DNA sequence: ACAACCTCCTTAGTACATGCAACCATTATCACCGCCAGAGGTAAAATAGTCAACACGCACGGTGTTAGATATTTATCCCTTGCGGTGATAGATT
């Protein structure tokens, strides 16, 4: 996720899960961690917004 | 007084425009050598220091194990092909 340059979770909140399969060494387990570590904050994945 | 005129006198004022390629030498010529400057040298001590000793202490990298990812294999699914049936187009008219 450092190689994939996602240095603000403000965009990890809205990048598609298929669009994280865009740099190698990022496979079936790391792609699966995302699915609740964002929720653990009191947040979610999948939250596009009209101003950022 | 002078005036310019006849002749060949010499003087010397000019010689259109746009562009690209190349490289930068020849001279000889005693600078003497004497003096001494601050001024080169270096010994011994200021402005301060080396790196070897014995300690100190840490980082980094490679060997080992683990992790998980990925590219393969498999198999599923959809979007696409090509033909066909027959579509309301293109556009002439109302």
From Swiss-Prot:
Post-translational modification: Acetylated on Lys-28 and Lys-29 in the presence of glucose. PatZ controls acetylation of Lys-29 but not of Lys-28.
Residues modified as N6-acetyllysine: 28-29
Region entry Alpha C-terminal domain (alpha-CTD), spans: 1-52
Functional summary from the UniProt entry: DNA-dependent RNA polymerase (RNAP) catalyzes the transcription of DNA into RNA using the four ribonucleoside triphosphates as substrates. This subunit plays an important role in subunit assembly since its dimerization is the first step in the sequential assembly of subunits to form the holoenzyme. Part of the processive rRNA transcription and antitermination complex (rrnTAC). The complex forms an RNA-chaperone ring around the RNA exit tunnel of RNAP. It supports rapid transcription and antitermination of rRNA operons, cotranscriptional rRNA folding, and annealing of distal rRNA regions to allow correct ribosome biogenesis.
Assembly: Homodimer. The RNAP catalytic core consists of 2 alpha, 1 beta, 1 beta' and 1 omega subunit. When a sigma factor is associated with the core the holoenzyme is formed, which can initiate transcription. Both the N- and C-terminus interact with different regions of transcriptional regulator CRP. The rRNA transcription and antitermination complex (rrnTAC) consists of RNAP, NusA, NusB, NusE (rpsJ), NusG, SubB, ribosomal protein S4, DNA and precursor rRNA; S4 is more flexible than other subunits.
Domain notes from UniProt: The N-terminal domain is essential for RNAP assembly and basal transcription, whereas the C-terminal domain is involved in interaction with transcriptional regulators (such as CRP) and with upstream promoter elements.
Family classification: Belongs to the RNA polymerase alpha chain family.
Name of this chain's protein: DNA-directed RNA polymerase subunit alpha
């Amino acid at each position: 996720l450092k190689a994939e340059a996602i240095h603000y979770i403000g965009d990890l909140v809205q990048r598609t899960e298929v669009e994280l399969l865009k740099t190698p060494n990022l496979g079936k387990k790391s792609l699966t961690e995302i699915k609740d570590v964002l929720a653990s904050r009191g947040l979610s994945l999948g939250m596009r917004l009209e101003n950022w």
